[PDB]
Design a protein around this nucleic acid. Sequence first.
RNA 1: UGCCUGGCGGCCGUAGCGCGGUGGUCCCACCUGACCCCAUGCCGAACUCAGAAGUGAAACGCCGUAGCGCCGAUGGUAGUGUGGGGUCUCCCCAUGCGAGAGUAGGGAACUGCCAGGCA
RNA 2: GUAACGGAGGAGCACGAAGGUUGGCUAAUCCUGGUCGGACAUCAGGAGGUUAGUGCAAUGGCAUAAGCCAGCUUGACUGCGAGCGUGACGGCGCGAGCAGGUGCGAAAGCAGGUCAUAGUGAUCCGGUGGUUCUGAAUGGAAGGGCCAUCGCUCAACGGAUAA
RNA 3: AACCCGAUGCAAACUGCGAAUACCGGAGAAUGUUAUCACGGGAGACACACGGCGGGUGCUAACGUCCGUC
RNA 4: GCGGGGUGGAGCAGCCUGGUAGCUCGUCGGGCUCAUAACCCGAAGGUCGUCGGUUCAAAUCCGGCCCCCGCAACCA
Lengths: 75, 177, 60, 116, 136, 50
Amino acid sequence: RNGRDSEAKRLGVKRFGGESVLAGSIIVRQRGTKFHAGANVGCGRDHTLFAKADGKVKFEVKGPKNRKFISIEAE
Amino acid sequence: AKLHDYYKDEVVKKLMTEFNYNSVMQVPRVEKITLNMGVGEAIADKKLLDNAAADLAAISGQKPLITKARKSVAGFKIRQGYPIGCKVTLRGERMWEFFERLITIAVPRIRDFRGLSAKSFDGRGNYSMGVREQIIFPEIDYDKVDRVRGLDITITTTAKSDEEGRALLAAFDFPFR
Amino acid sequence: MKKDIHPKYEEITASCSCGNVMKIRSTVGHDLNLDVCSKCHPFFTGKQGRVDRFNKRFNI
Amino acid sequence: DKKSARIRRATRARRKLQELGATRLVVHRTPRHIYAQVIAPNGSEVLVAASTVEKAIAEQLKYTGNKDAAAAVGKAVAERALEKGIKDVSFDRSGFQYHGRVQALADAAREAGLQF
Amino acid sequence: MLQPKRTKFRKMHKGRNRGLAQGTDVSFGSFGLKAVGRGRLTARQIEAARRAMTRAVKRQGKIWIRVFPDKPITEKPLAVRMGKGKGNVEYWVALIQPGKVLYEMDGVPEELAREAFKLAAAKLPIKTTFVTKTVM
Amino acid sequence: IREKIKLVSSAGTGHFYTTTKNKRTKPEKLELKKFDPVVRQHVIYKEAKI
RNA sequence: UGCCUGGCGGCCGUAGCGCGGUGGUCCCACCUGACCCCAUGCCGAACUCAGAAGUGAAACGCCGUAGCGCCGAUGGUAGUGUGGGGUCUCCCCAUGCGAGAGUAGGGAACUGCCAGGCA
RNA sequence: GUAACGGAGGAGCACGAAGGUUGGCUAAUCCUGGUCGGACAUCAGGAGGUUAGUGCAAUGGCAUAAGCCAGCUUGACUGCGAGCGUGACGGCGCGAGCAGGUGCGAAAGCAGGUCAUAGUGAUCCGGUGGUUCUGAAUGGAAGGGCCAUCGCUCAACGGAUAA
RNA sequence: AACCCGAUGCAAACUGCGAAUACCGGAGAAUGUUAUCACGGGAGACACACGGCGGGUGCUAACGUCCGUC
RNA sequence: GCGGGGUGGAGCAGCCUGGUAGCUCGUCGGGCUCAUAACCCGAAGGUCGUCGGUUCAAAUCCGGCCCCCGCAACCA
Ligand SMILES: [K+]
Ligand SMILES: [K+]
Ligand SMILES: [Mg+2]
Ligand SMILES: [Mg+2]
Ligand SMILES: [Mg+2]
Ligand SMILES: [Mg+2]
Ligand SMILES: [Mg+2]
Ligand SMILES: [Mg+2]
Ligand SMILES: [Mg+2]
Ligand SMILES: [Mg+2]
Ligand SMILES: [Mg+2]
Ligand SMILES: [Mg+2]
Ligand SMILES: [Mg+2]
Ligand SMILES: [Mg+2]
Ligand SMILES: [Mg+2]
Ligand SMILES: [Mg+2]
Ligand SMILES: [Mg+2]
Ligand SMILES: [Mg+2]
Ligand SMILES: [Mg+2]
Ligand SMILES: [Mg+2]
Ligand SMILES: [Mg+2]
Ligand SMILES: [Mg+2]
Ligand SMILES: [Mg+2]
Ligand SMILES: [Zn+2]
């Protein structure tokens, strides 16, 4: 009665901390906001986080809920 | 109005002495009176809920809010969002007028009235009572009554405990057995 | 209060057998005559064996 | 808790303004007083402020907690901002409805020359 | 025969049985029977040992079973080939690591407990040792 | 169950959009203001057969 | 300069709760009215407006207090990369990395900008 | 990223609002009191804190809610697209920003469908509408092209044939 | 005997914790016949085997079977 | 292995497409008869194999567990 699975979706972090990226570059693919958009980072309809400016990827924990945020530090 | 005037003129002084309250703000106040009719029969007939609403309107002097089932219940054969009751919230002047009318006229008109229970406080100083017949209220006309409808009356108070709540009602000489 | 949605509510005179007269706002409109009120009701006013029976009926 | 409800109501717009990096005109309203602060994009520095608790504004007002007082504060905060050279700001109603006193303050600030 | 009343899943990966045990102390009684070897204890084995020690103490004192068989073991029927899906659940085991206190006893003399545990140990596939409660 | 329909421009350009509709639940004709690229204006578009 | 209060932040429990005490000049809150502006699927409860008779009761703030939450070593233990070994379903040795839990202990936040009251 | 006739479940849709935006709101469950009314209806208060909710599986999300209610609406826009993800390829996905025109909002803004991830079918052939293209001597026309769109449980789902 | 409280275990599809490694990026030195990448000519190959380590399956059966990695 | 079942005492419906147990016989009470049968009138009797699951709600849908049928159980 088993024998089924779906195709792997290649989610996860595409650009890690300190990596230089061009504007538009996808930083993380995810289901829901496991990571939240910080400064110079946009959130797509599928919760993809992407660079809105050229710069270095920066991961940070912030706010009362200690949520993880991704920001781009301008070069 | 009169009962509100009475509250300020007499009730506050009696309660202040009784409980040795430090401040007037400590003295219990009647926040609101809510009149509710649970019209289960409404599911069969929509008109019955409308008639119940009209009765509640006449007693309250205020257009009732229709209430609907929070969740589906198989036992009562009700689905969520189906209108099964009506309520009115009385505050300020309208509340005091109703409170007066209830004590002065409606409560005496209750059949075989032997006083109201003093054990009907919820533990937080709020008093709830049920009216078996809408006839007791003078606004309703016995001749034009299609069906006998009861209602449940709750008096919400700022009283911290039942003792403070009963004292407040007693100050107004609310009838208690 | 919202306008045009509520029952007409006006002061009316309520008269009782005891002679207590009360002017109250109501939807009733017409003046009311009451059989009883808080003033005259028995409960409010406070107006509300076998061995004795045997002795009375069969006193010898 | 009315305050907590109001803060919740204010949060979405405040987070948006911070993300935009806008200079913010924050209004606080109490029954007796109204306050206006122009806060820098960082949110930790007040550039200019005006309130009915200030004597200069208060002395000219009959009551500090009405629409006329609100208009006075709006004019005052804007004039001080213009001297500072702020000019462009975003209005933060701070969870209060954009109506009545809050609206009167905003309209006065716009009339004075603050852009929003 | 101990068995979970219900489980989220019917079948379980074989897994491995490495490491030292948790629950290495006598926690409920005076005396305990501790595993010195690694292995699986079937529900039937646990029951056999329980009956042996209970009879030896003649319904005196109290016995605790510290292990519960919550791991389902499947088997394929005879003359079935490989494949065609995982086998059917046949029995339940508890995984035992060295140091695990299997049973505890109280309300009996030590000599009686030692005899009872010896009788129980003869039913078990793992080497065991008698232990007593300690202050620390 | 949902059926394909056309939304036809009121401008007379002949430009159309396509969408689906549940005709049984919603018999009434769908009408929306949509951009007509031919006239380059938002105009009323009215439901028609696909 | 200090104290007190309000607003906006940093920070995100060593910062939160509980418990006890405490504050109204100002501020804040409750509060007083509502024809209004505006509002209630009914209700001036809320929202809103016009105010200031009363009270800090509640709320809130502040202070105290480990019953809690929370933080938390040292040492040991588990695991593990590389190389080697055994009695090899699992371990051991050399070397490097080294938890989790628990223990001692800590802990009743700290801090920036602006405004007002007071000294 | 990763196989097995390994272990477990779902899809082949739905929705003109269940989409956009503005404003507002916050759950389950239990206890106490209350006409009919009971284990369970509606009402009041308390405890509790999402143990609820999310159109539909599971997982990850969600209070600034992504959950719930109301007003106004058609951005479920058209042309494009820096840059990037994922694929042997065909493809598939995310996307600031630009132009035109639009909705909501006082404004900052937000909107190129829906919390996200299933809801699907190449090419050929042919149909329908449109069109500064083509038009076999020439003007037309037919037919073709281009743009929009329609017809496969071709489900053995990269589909040997119409059979 | 629910619930709750104290004590005790268990989990591939539990997580109020959490390594080693591995992987991505940056910098620097030494070493290495550019060991790298792109484009173009020519392929072969797409039956793998055993051993170690981590696992599914099988009986922690198989010189069994199916993956990862050396 | 793949299918079809299990519903008043009996034999059959209802399931598909949840909410809303029928038919014939039998049983019971009354009547007709000298009496019995036949016949006539009136009435009762399955909460759906047995648990679980889903659902506001289960004969109905899902999954066992038991039972009872049918088909299959092969080629060297
Ligand atoms: K095929
Ligand atoms: K291998
Ligand atoms: Mg597979
Ligand atoms: Mg997957
Ligand atoms: Mg896979
Ligand atoms: Mg250490
Ligand atoms: Mg530690
Ligand atoms: Mg591979
Ligand atoms: Mg492979
Ligand atoms: Mg490009
Ligand atoms: Mg052809
Ligand atoms: Mg020609
Ligand atoms: Mg020709
Ligand atoms: Mg053509
Ligand atoms: Mg294929
Ligand atoms: Mg795990
Ligand atoms: Mg490197
Ligand atoms: Mg091949
Ligand atoms: Mg091969
Ligand atoms: Mg291989
Ligand atoms: Mg192996
Ligand atoms: Mg093997
Ligand atoms: Mg082999
Ligand atoms: Zn009287």
